[PDB]
Amino acid sequence: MKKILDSAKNYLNTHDKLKTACLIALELPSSSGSAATYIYLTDYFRDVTYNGILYRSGKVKSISSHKQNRQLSIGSLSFTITGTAEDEVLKLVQNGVSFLDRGITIHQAIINEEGNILPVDPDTDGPLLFFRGRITGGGIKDNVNTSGIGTSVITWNCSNQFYDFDRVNGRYTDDASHRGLEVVNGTLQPSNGAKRPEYQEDYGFFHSNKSTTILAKYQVKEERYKLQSKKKLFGLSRSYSLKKYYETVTKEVDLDFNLAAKFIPVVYGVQKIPGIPIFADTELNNPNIVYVVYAFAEGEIDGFLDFYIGDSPMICFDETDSDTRTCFGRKKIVGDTMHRLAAGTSTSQPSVHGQEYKYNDGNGDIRIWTFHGKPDQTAAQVLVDIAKKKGFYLQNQNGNGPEYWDSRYKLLDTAYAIVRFTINENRTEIPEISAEVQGKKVKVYNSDGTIKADKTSLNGIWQLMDYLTSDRYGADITLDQFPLQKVISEAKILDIIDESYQTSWQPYWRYVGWNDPLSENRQIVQLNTILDTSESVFKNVQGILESFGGAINNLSGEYRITVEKYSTNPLRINFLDTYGDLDLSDTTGRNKFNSVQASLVDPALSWKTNSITFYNSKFKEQDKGLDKKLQLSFANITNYYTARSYADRELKKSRYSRTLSFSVPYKFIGIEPNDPIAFTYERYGWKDKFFLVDEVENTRDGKINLVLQEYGEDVFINSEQVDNSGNDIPDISNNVLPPRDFKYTPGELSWLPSLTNNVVYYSIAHSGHVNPYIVQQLENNPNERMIQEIGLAIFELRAVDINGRRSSPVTLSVDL
Amino acid sequence: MKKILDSAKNYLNTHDKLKTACLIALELPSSSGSAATYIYLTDYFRDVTYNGILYRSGKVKSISSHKQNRQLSIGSLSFTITGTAEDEVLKLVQNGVSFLDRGITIHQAIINEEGNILPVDPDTDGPLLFFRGRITGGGIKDNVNTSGIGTSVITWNCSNQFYDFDRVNGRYTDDASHRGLEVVNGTLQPSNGAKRPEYQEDYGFFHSNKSTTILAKYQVKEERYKLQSKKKLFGLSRSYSLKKYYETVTKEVDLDFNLAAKFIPVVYGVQKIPGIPIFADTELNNPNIVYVVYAFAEGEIDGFLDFYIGDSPMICFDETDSDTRTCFGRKKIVGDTMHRLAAGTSTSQPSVHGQEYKYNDGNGDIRIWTFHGKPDQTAAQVLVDIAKKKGFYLQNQNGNGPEYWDSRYKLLDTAYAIVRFTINENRTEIPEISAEVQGKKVKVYNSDGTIKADKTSLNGIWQLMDYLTSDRYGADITLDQFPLQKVISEAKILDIIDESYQTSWQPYWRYVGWNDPLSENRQIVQLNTILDTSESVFKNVQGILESFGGAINNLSGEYRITVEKYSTNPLRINFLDTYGDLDLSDTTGRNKFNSVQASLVDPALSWKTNSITFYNSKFKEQDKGLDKKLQLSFANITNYYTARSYADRELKKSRYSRTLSFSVPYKFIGIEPNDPIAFTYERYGWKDKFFLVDEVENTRDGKINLVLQEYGEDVFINSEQVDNSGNDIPDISNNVLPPRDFKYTPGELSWLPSLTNNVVYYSIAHSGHVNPYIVQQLENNPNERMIQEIGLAIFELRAVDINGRRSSPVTLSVDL
């Protein structure tokens, strides 16, 4: 809906002969860089002046139609400026000019008797906006027929901001791609022309080419040059088939040849992402400590959360993981994070910047230095101080002074986590570190004008708009093209409370992505997003739109992010009003279903795929007892219950599946592709019947070519679901188990064999005996006790596997 | 550019009424095999007789248009022979005949007043060629309307040599596919109908089905039935998106189910390729020695170069690799290859056929016999002699006499490498051998007529020429369809010296692919390509064309491989000459870019992907400070610097991005789809403006339908580059390192623990003590010394990991 005013509504209803005029505020293709110079053309005939400039009226023969469906579709127009005007043709074909950018603004001025009749609320009462886009256009077509009249038309094409649909805006993890190295002057590379000059001086990605090999030195044979995939289980969109779709999903990516893995992700909410090994080296005079800088996400994270030192996280999943290895906090009920590690008291709080120190299970001292992104942040005093002492191995191997790391080695917008290992004989290899990262600071607006962009990383269209209004990783949209009021309205539409489940049965309340239990948190579409910035802007934005359900629609010149909705105030379009043509198209054979299957990245499965399925006794009995399953995978939703409700809603949406296609007059201007209307064609039997538009085609003439979708109340009324809490699937099975029992009987043999069946020799560590004891599993009997020979001594029992993993030391402080 | 002669130029300018006639020299569809019988049809009306045959003039109502752009596009025509001629329809529908081949040559004879006005320089002064292609044609269309007129036309289709665009012409590695086994007579396979009879008697891929399992016996659990990918990082061509494209790139292929892995690659220049295991066995009476024949590339390699015994090459990268393991030659400055290994003196020379023997790092004796391809080569006396002694295990296991290997077991065009292992307790498994192979015998022609072939694999259109004029793996093109002078001209265009970088700073001068430092070697587009013959002829050829930049174009009947160029002698086409239409299309939105990114398989990264990126201050300021990055990946270029210059050129080419489309009269015949013209439309302001044509559509009528592309001199002028030599990334991280220090102090304790934390037990081997000692890493302290107990004894220290790798033995010959 565009409001239009009651005055303009009355004029459109009564006057019945209205003189439309288009106000094209073109921006001239300019070379060499300067201030923007605008040529103001209008179609009309006189010279229509609107708030200042004349808007000359000697060109622009015609304007194309602005067709845009409920799918982001590079919405494109095309001028027809006469090719007999020397000025425009010269400006088009001049050598040197480049016009990738350059806004075009079109106003459809409804001329009054004397000068525009003032529609549009809270924009100064002038013409309706019509395009407000960028210019990506062609050129001349000359005909010069030898018989007679020939034509010559300049066809400026112009499209939405999402032109060049394969644009891949992302910051990468290379120094050259981070501060924009150039080859100006003779042979040196200054730092010019990169995203914000702060990056130009951000000398912090310089050692990133060689770090991967340095880690491959201290790493397992299999996981060499190998990260996990930064985005797993992307959204199914009917472009795939289930077998092919699930084949494309890969758990690990080969960093050696795949450079797309180096692109820095964008994470909203709470989600597990792998860490890119930016930096790697070992301390001098003690070359077992390894310093690794891991880049995870993009600017100003809420906080790092529960690092992964392998496939065993620091905070145990359930009493099951509590029993297997030594973990300090719990996860199912209570939201213990790394802050619990830092403080020692059970807390539910993200990492508070530079202090989330040592994680110590019996193996090695893992000191992790966690840093968010910031508009102004400085490198850790750890790396800078150690480089000042010149205590890095590769420094003196190459001969680098106090410039290997320095105060100018910042990392301005990224989520980098300096990780320190202590690789003893007890942790043989550096594992593959991933982490759970909580969100990106989405500017959350409020109907009031108080902007909350502080910690939140909310869940809704706020995420999409933040990805849209970001220079660094999004697509420049300037944040002035959005109307804030309806954006807030649709965001409030998203977070309508879902009285289906309860917060009591959400075990992992925290890692779904809501803080603080008691508060409501039961919101429809609580999506948690990974946006790997290596795919494309077009595809990421359409992925988010498919996730929450909606479309971006620059129809009235503003982007106006709409969502699916039900409301008691629709437009009452009667067939007599519209026009004559009325197409009905039941795509009912292929596009409606009786049961749905979904796919989540469930935190209740240690971020592993989980399946939700229904069946319906009403639906299948309606069909004829035919089995037909909708198939789905939710790339962005991690809460089991909200994904379940969303699957039910999309199932019923499929169940409706009716399309109308007709054309309405200029009376109904302002319609956007998610506005409710009620059709009342009397022959059909249709008295008010809820439809949501799917296409709007604004035409230069004035008619609108609508296309409808059939959406009853049942899809939005939502259903009631059963709790799923006991069916948790912790990832217990990635660690070798410790001795089951242990006591000293005056042997120290009481250790029962580890349940992990591939163990070769246990290790015993005395207080004074420098040489550890070795007992070997020559025979493996799960109920049997093997013996050691042997006061105030401390003891450690680490089971060793055929790989050397070592299991959480069970320690006894006994008196001999 | 076809020269067309001054006489023909004058006639086309003056006469203004010219009687065109087409000379169609069809080749009759013939069955059962015989000499070619040609029907000579012509369009005209009388009987136009050119150089012998009378060219009957009673058929062929019309001929289609010959359109071909800067993309090899199966350039196709279509005859229309009257279907009322009994002879032609009978030859069409006769059952038994096949015409897969059969040349069609069309001459557009410009009839003089009395008999053809003698154009075409060099060809007998006769008419221009028009098609010169092969016939892949359709058939009748009858109508016989009951009302009246009915039509009947024979639509002979005919297309370029690259018809059947999914042909997979390649040699593969099986006995039947190597010598064409057939099923004639009772119960024996003869060797008939294969590429040249020398393969028919080349009985040398017989033991190829079972070799892979024989190695899988002596091989790691992971690399079992697992080769690397013969072509890594193929060319991005906008058909892919970055994420999908980089995901498709796979480092290893599963040989068990992937039979495309067995196809023999073709390599030009130096590049790393894996070795297909076409043979494997062990000696009797001593079954530790393993004999493996590894097929690498095709005929007449310049030489094998730096074999790989794993991920650790024989020739160390830098002092870094020199320190880790024991490797003899250097690579980053000096070009030490396996010939250094054989001779013992630092050399830079490819393998000299069958003698590049033992590589001996302390572990086992790696005896490698290297063979090139050759039109007449014989199997080594090694395999034949051992088979004569009948000392192969599987021989007497199965009961095979002196025919398991024999002088008949040649490999008459293959780059095979008889590799001998000595699997001791010191090299537990046979590793996965890959290697670096130098090129193909490319026939390099010279303006003089002296063909230099055998010598070097060059880098240019000569590679594409060899791939085109090869019966074995290319597409039969007979080498008579090419005009040698234009090909030599284009090759000289490619190798114009790039005064951007210097040879002083290209570390791996040799392993890029140019021999002998001092010489120039600074050439634009030094592509070093891999052509796996399992993809297709069409896609491989377009791969080379996208690599160096160019197109294959048979408009004038000759393939005429053009490349992009700038020249001061263009054609001066004025709009008044053209006709009436003049299209213009600025795809500035999607096809104009500011920053480039590239992907190379550098030899300065042990053949691992590397990223070159630019930012440009002029361009981004020209746009509006809008970041839109061109993305590239060079599959064929291994120079950092030449790929850098190529990325700059292609970025600027994208920056220009203008297309014209118009038609010109027959005066301008000969225009070729990559020729320079200067278009001078007066109104646009366009005085001479350099365009390279993108399309040429020769028409039966005479008009030519050109399409232009805008390339200013800035793309060809090229720019300067920065030194990049210190930023090398050798693969140090693929081997276990030995003890850091070692000396004997009057026991042997001095060995400092290996930097590899994957260490279990060191091994000490005395001169007389049969049983080696074991010192175990019960505690790992990087600065500590552990002890052995214990004249004229020899010592060896091999660190052992949890896998059994073993390091390079550190040895002291001390007196106790």
* 3-state SS track over A552-590: CCCCCCCCCCEECCCCCCCEEECHHHHCCCEEEECCHHH
A696 neighbors A555 (Cβ within 8 angstroms): yes
Nearest to A205 by CA among A165, A171, A236: A171
Q: Who's near B576: CB < 8 A, 6+ residues apart? A: none
- The one-letter amino acid at B38: Y
The closest alpha carbon to B112, from B35, B21, B238, belongs to B21
3-state helix, strand, coil split of chain A in percent (to 5) is 20, 25, 55
Helices B537-548 and B461-468: angle between axes, nearest 10 degrees = 170
**Segments of B647-726 assigned E as strands:** 659-664, 676-679, 690-698, 704-710
Distance in angstroms (rounded) separating the CA atoms of residues B471 and B466: 10
The neighbour count for residue A699, using CB atoms within 10 Å, is 15
Locus of tokens 């994208």:
B654
Q: What are phi and psi of B178, to 5 degrees?
A: -90, -35
Under a CB-based contact definition with an 8 Å cutoff, are residues A789 and A774 in contact? no
Interface test with A, best of B245, B317, B590 (most A CBs within 10 A): B590
Contact A423, A218 (CB under 8 A): yes
Residue with tokens 């022609």: B445
A213/B732 Cβ within 8 A:
yes
| Strand partners for A109 | A21
Question: Minimal CA–CA distance to A529: which of A646, A636, A415, A643?
Answer: A636
Count, in order, helices (H) and strands (E) of chain A: 19, 37
Kindly provide the residue ranges of all beta strands, DSSP E only, lying in B455-566, ordered along the sequence: 530-532, 550-551, 562-563
Residue of A nearest to B324 (CA): A217
Q: What is the distance in angstroms between the Cα of A450 and the nearest Cα belonging to chain B? A: 30
- E strand or H helix at B211: helix B211-217
Query: To probe the interface with A, which of B243, B608, B610, B619 has the most A CB atoms within 10 Å?
Result: B243
CA distance A268 to A533: 13
β-strand A367-370 against A529-532: which pairing, if any? Answer: unpaired
Give the total residue count for chain B: 816
Is residue A566 a contact partner of residue A711, using CB atoms and an 8 Å limit? Answer: yes
Contact A63, A79 (CB under 8 A): yes
Asked whether the CA dihedral B507, B512, B517, B523 is positive or negative, the reply is negative
Contacts of B233 in chain A (CB under 8 A): 257
Of A564, A570, A716, A721, nearest to A642 by C-alpha is A721
Contact assessment for residue B686 and residue B679, using Cβ atoms and an 8 Å cutoff: yes
Set of chain A residues whose Cβ sits within 8 Å of the Cβ of B730: 213
Report the residue from B233, B243, B779 with minimal CB separation from A257.
B233
What whole-number distance in Å separates Cα of residue B540 and Cα of residue B534? 9
CB atoms inside a 10 Å sphere around CB A11? 18
The Cα B461–Cα A56 span in angstroms is 56
- Compute the distance between CA of residue B544 and CA of residue B527 in angstroms, rounded to an integer: 9
CB contacts < 8 A (A, B)? 230
Nearest Cα residue in chain B from A211? B729
Measured in angstroms, the CA of B731 and the nearest CA of chain A are apart by: 7
B615–A182 CB contact, under 8 Å: yes
Structure-block tokens of residue B268 = 């030009």
Phi, psi of B25 (to 5 degrees): -100, 80
Q: B658: distance to nearest CA of chain A, Å?
A: 9
Nearest CA in chain B to A217: B733
- Helices (H) and strands (E) in chain B — how many of each? 19, 38
Q: Is B654 helix (H, G, I), strand (E, B) or coil?
A: helix
Longest dimension (CA), chain B: 118
Question: Across the beta sheet with A367-370, what order do the strands follow?
Answer: A276-282, A289-295, A416-422, A367-370
- CB–CB contact A186 B720 (8 Å): yes
Residues with Cβ within 8 Å of B519's Cβ and at least 6 positions away in sequence, in order, are none
* Rounded Cα distance, A674 and A694, in Å: 7
Report the b/e string of A551-570 with b at 16+ CB within 10 A.
Answer: bbbbbbbbbbbbbbbbeeeb
Other C-beta atoms closer than 10 Å to the C-beta of A796 total 17
Residue A165: its chain B contacts at CB < 8 A? Answer: 590
**What resolution in Å is listed for this PDB structure?**
3.9
Q: How far is CA A209 from the centre of its chain?
A: 26
Residues of A in contact with B715 (CB under 8 A): none
**What does the alpha-carbon distance between residue B661 and residue B697 come to, in Å, rounded to a whole number?**
11
Q: Could you give the CA distance from residue A16 to residue A449 in angstroms, rounded to a whole number? A: 40
Burial B512-543 (b: 16+ CB within 10 A, else e): bbbbeeeeebbbbbbbbbbbbbbbbbbebbbb
Q: Phi and psi dihedrals of B329, rounded to 5?
A: -90, 170
Token pair belonging to A27: 């921006």
Check CB contact under 8 Å for B720 and A476. Answer: no
d(CA A97, CA B622): 8
A56 Cβ neighbours under 8 A, 6+ residues apart: A39, A40, A41, A42, A47
Contact A209 B729 (CB under 8 A): yes
Cα→Cα distances A687→A584, A615, A684, B138, Å = 16, 32, 9, 59
Q: Chain B residue closest to A283 (CA)?
A: B782
State whether B623 and A98 contact (CB < 8 Å): yes
β-pair type (A571-573, A676-679):
parallel
Note whether A288 contacts B251, CB cutoff 8 Å.
no
C-alpha to C-alpha distance for B489 and B487, rounded to whole angstroms: 5
Under a CB-based contact definition with an 8 Å cutoff, are residues B379 and B436 in contact? no
Total Cβ atoms within 10 A of residue A13: 9
How many angstroms away from the CA of A241 is the closest CA of chain B?
16
Residues in contact with A748: Cβ distance below 8 Å, sequence separation at least 6, in sequence order: A742, A764, A788, A790, A795, A812
Distance CA B763, CA B785 (A): 15
Candidates A217, A238, A127; CA nearest to A630 is A238
Give CB contacts under 8 A, 24+ apart, made by A475-478.
A475/A161, A475/A162, A475/A167, A475/A169, A475/A537, A475/A541, A476/A161, A476/B626, A477/A161, A477/A559
| A3 three-state secondary structure | coil
Nearest one of B607, B732, B699, B710 to B653, comparing CA atoms:
B710
Instruction: Measure A670 CA to nearest chain B CA, in Å.
Output: 28
Contact B677, B642 (CB under 8 A): no
Which segments of B692-782 does DSSP mark as H helices, in order? 713-717
β-strand B676-679 against B571-573: which pairing, if any?
Answer: parallel
Look at the block and give the residue holding tokens 């014209």.
B660
Q: List own/partner pairs for B476-479 with CB under 8 A and 24 or more apart.
A: B476/B161, B477/B161, B477/B559
CB contact (8 A) between residue B249 and residue A258: yes
Name which of B590, B778, B655 is nearest A537 in CA terms.
B590
> What are the E-state strand segments in A93-199?
103-111, 128-129, 133-135, 140-142, 152-154, 157-159
Tokens of A476: 């420049």
Q: Which of A425, A472, A533 to mutate to test the interface with B (most CBs of B within 10 A)?
A: A425
The minimal CB distance from A138 to the residues B242, B247, B585 is found for B585
Breaks in chain B (C–N beyond 2.5 Å) sit after 746, 790
Residue of A nearest to B229 (CA): A257
Q: Cβ separation of A218 and B712 shorter than 8 Å?
A: no
Per-residue burial over B609-621, b if 16 or more Cβ lie within 10 Å, else e, is bbbbbbbbeebbb
Phi/psi for A326 (5° steps) reads -95, 100
* Contact flag B721-A183 (C-beta cutoff 8 Å): yes
CA A590 to chain centre: 30
Q: Are the CB atoms for B284 and B392 separated by under 8 Å?
A: yes
Taking contacts as CB-CB distances below 8 angstroms, the residues of chain A near B622 are 31-33, 98
Strand-pair category, B704-710 with B659-664:
antiparallel
> Residues A159, A133: contact at Cβ < 8 Å?
yes
Say how far apart CA B279 and CA A80 lie, in whole Å.
Answer: 70
- Tokens 């049965």 correspond to A505
Among candidates B589, B760, B780 on the partner chain, residue whose Cβ is nearest the Cβ of A136: B589
**Which of A76, A98, A477, A775 is the best residue to mutate to test the B interface, defined by the most B CB atoms within 10 Å of its own CB?**
A98
C-alpha angle B193/B197/B199, rounded to 5°? 95
Identify all chain A residues contacting B585, using CB atoms and an 8 Å cutoff: 138-139
Inter-chain residue contact A259 with B246, CB threshold 8 Å:
yes
Contact B731 A213 (CB under 8 A): yes
Side-chain half-sphere exposure of A752, counting CA atoms within 13 A: 6
Q: Give the helix/strand (H/E) hosting B434.
A: strand B434-438
Shortest Cα distance from B540 to chain A (angstroms)? 21
Question: Which tokens go with B34?
Answer: 């015989």
A326-344: b or e for each residue (b if 16 or more CB lie within 10 Å)?
A: bbbbbbbeebbbbbbbbee
β-bridge partners, A762: A775, A799
HSE on the CB side for A693, CA within 13 Å? Answer: 28
